[PDB]
From Swiss-Prot, chain B:
The lineage of its organism: Eukaryota, Fungi, Dikarya, Ascomycota, Saccharomycotina. Present with 8430 molecules/cell in log phase SD medium. ct(6)A is involved in promoting decoding efficiency. It is an unstable modification that can be easily hydrolyzed and converted to t(6)A during nucleoside preparation by conventional methods. Its main location: mitochondrion. Gene3D superfamilies: NAD(P)-binding Rossmann-like Domain (3.40.50.720). It is a multi-pass membrane protein. The gene is TCD1. It comes from Saccharomyces cerevisiae (strain ATCC 204508 / S288c) (Baker's yeast). It is found in: Mitochondrion outer membrane. This is tRNA threonylcarbamoyladenosine dehydratase 1. Belongs to the HesA/MoeB/ThiF family.
Length: 363, 361
């Protein structure tokens, strides 16, 4: 009773009575007991949450003893969740720790997280499998739960550059790109706060399908804690920064109008023209061409245009460019209808064709 | 077996390159203090490679130091902090030699502790709280040319992004760093000592008021780790042939000459003991590169404060050559009162800035 309070005396003195009282009553769901999740579960419990749940099927491979905070030679081949509850039941016997040695899915979530008829306060994504994460975040958002997602920690080697901001604003982190694009594709643009760092290492040997490669055995720690920290502060009501968002709705509208015009010029069907709404103009400009004309590189006064004459309107057959560039394009390649090989050089058409192949991956 | 080490540490091996690891193995790392930050540090370098660490921490694993310490559990409370680690780390890294030391750290024993076995220390990590001992340590680190990192403070820290690693010189902002740097500079050293710290502004809710009797307040369970992990990350990335930010220092040595030149010149126009390193302190640390009269950073100079007192650190003020000339005629030569020339708003701020400095002596 009064022995518990002396263990966390530090946090009681910092966040206060009102703040700390609010943390105890919460219930957190950790999806991924891996090298990054490991820490959250610990730190959350060390800093003193009574109830958390860990969801991870796989066992601790000899690999993980480089990063995993609480594991040890003796825990090789222990289900990652099973090891935590064992190495946290010596920190806090008071703490209920629901350990689930099963995989998470869209279909089992309803009957697994609500278990014993109690809602969760927080979902912490600490997954690796792209296909599984996006699904979790979709489910996390659409049910309106306070939720934070870890991005990958691969290629990262400086703890100063790490950050927590809205998934929308991870432009320059190649690791995040793979998920937020796939998550944007399902409509979710700016709902989620996430960890990551804008650290690029292209001069390394290492080695357009981008993948998770190596990682420095400390960094995952940094992430885990920085999440826990961010949880602890958000939950408590301590002052933090709000997440800035990258929705240039005004800019997406102005573009759409330059496309919605083109559809009245060509005089094409209303059942194909309405397909491109504000929602999808955003995706196209921000995630595909990254606010940059693929022919030149300019970013001032752009517009959309049907890419080929004969083919239907879709993401595979459309592109943005400078007004002047779409003026030419509209006039030359599709209205007069001459082959695009004489209007555009080799260099560019290879950059375009691949830039659709990459879009066809996320479809 | 070698194979154990490699297959266990593989992901790092593949990250930094075998040539990188070779160096990590060679390292003999002294970690002074193993309380919150120290504990973190120690664990990670062992866990991430290093097979030779010394730890120096008297106090025992307090029941409160559970939401902080990196491994410690209820079973091993009331146990020497250095031992607790040795046990947990010798279960994860049997290959690793962790010479724990119950004893406390002094300027005198330092050598007879660290060099005892005969191996020269490659890297020192300050994780202390007693300011005296910390300075005494950082002092020792530099005089014995040992690549050294030092935790500053985790007091009033909320933001895991603001955590920076850099030189003492650059930590102007972080309020905690002052007491540590100030003394350090006045011992005769304000460059070379790498330090982790958050320059996170003092949180408003729990302009001429600065009297440094301000100290450490409450921690936040997670933050110590951020510091620990980061200075581990740092040490690992440095030792291994891996690229790095390369922290750069704000020691305006050129400036100090040009301002001292004004002071030295004022002495020859009147009727010289003041050092260049002493000015640098007066300039950067006390007046903070800004006149207390105007606030401008341009065309600055020194000048004897009042004619009655001896030329000391508590009786020379930095200001514009504009302000030097006026002050020189009116207070040094014409012999006027101080209340007569300068506003009381200034003369207070100047008094406090001496009562600040008065402490550090
Ligand atoms: N679909 C999934 N649902 C839940 N956990 C998963 C799923 N796929 C993988 N995991 C686990 O989550 C871990 C992610 O942690 P990490 O690789 O350290 O970021 C993996 O190592 C798996 O053990
Ligand atoms: N003079 C000293 N020499 C070495 N270690 C010290 C000295 N004074 C205090 N410490 C240790 O510094 C650590 C700081 O950790 P903490 O008290 O948790 O902030 C404690 O574990 C102390 O035992
Ligand atoms: Cl959120
Ligand atoms: Cl063992
Ligand atoms: Na809330
Ligand atoms: Na519109
Ligand atoms: Na150094
Ligand atoms: Na400290
Ligand atoms: Na930063
Ligand atoms: Na100097």
């Amino acid at each position: 009773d009064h022995l518990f309070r002396e263990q966390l005396a530090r946090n009681y003195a910092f966040l206060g009575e009102e703040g700390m009282r609010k943390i105890k009553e919460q219930y957190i769901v950790i999806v991924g007991a891996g090298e990054v999740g490991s820490w959250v579960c610990t730190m959350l419990i060390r800093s003193g949450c009574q109830k958390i749940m860990i969801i991870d099927p796989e066992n601790i491979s000899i690999d993980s003893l480089n990063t995993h905070c609480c594991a040890v030679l003796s825990d090789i081949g222990k289900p990652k969740v099973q090891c935590l509850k064992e190495h946290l039941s010596k920190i806090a016997p008071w703490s209920e720790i629901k350990a689930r040695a099963k995989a998470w899915t869209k279909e089992n979530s309803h009957d697994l997280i609500f278990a014993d008829g109690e809602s969760p306060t927080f979902i912490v994504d600490c997954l690796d499998n792209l296909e599984s994460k996006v699904d979790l975040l979709e489910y996390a958002h659409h049910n309106k739960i306070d939720v934070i997602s870890s991005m990958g920690v691969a290629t990262k080697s400086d703890p100063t550059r790490v950050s927590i901001n809205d998934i929308s604003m991870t432009e320059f982190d190649p690791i995040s790109r793979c998920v937020r694009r796939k998550l944007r594709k399902r409509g979710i643009a700016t709902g989620i706060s996430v960890v990551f760092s804008n650290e690029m290492l292209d001069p390394r040997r290492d080695d357009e399908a981008l993948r998770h490669l190596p990682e420095l055995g400390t960094m995952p720690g940094i992430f885990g804690l920085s999440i826990a920290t961010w949880i602890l502060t958000k939950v408590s009501g301590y002052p933090m920064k709000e997440n800035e968002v990258k929705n240039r709705l005004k800019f997406y509208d102005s573009i759409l109008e330059t496309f919605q015009k083109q559809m009245a010029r060509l005089n094409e069907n209303k059942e194909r023209s309405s397909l491109l709404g504000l929602e999808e103009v955003g995706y196209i400009v921000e995630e595909m061409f990254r606010g940059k004309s693929p022919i030149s590189g300019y970013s001032t006064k752009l517009a959309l245009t049907k890419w080929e004459a004969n083919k239907e309107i879709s993401l595979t057959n459309v592109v943005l460019m400078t007004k002047e560039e779409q003026e030419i394009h509209e006039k030359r390649i599709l209205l007069d209808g001459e082959k695009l090989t004489a209007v555009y050089s080799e260099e560019v058409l290879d950059f375009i064709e691949r830039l659709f192949k990459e879009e066809e991956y996320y479809s």
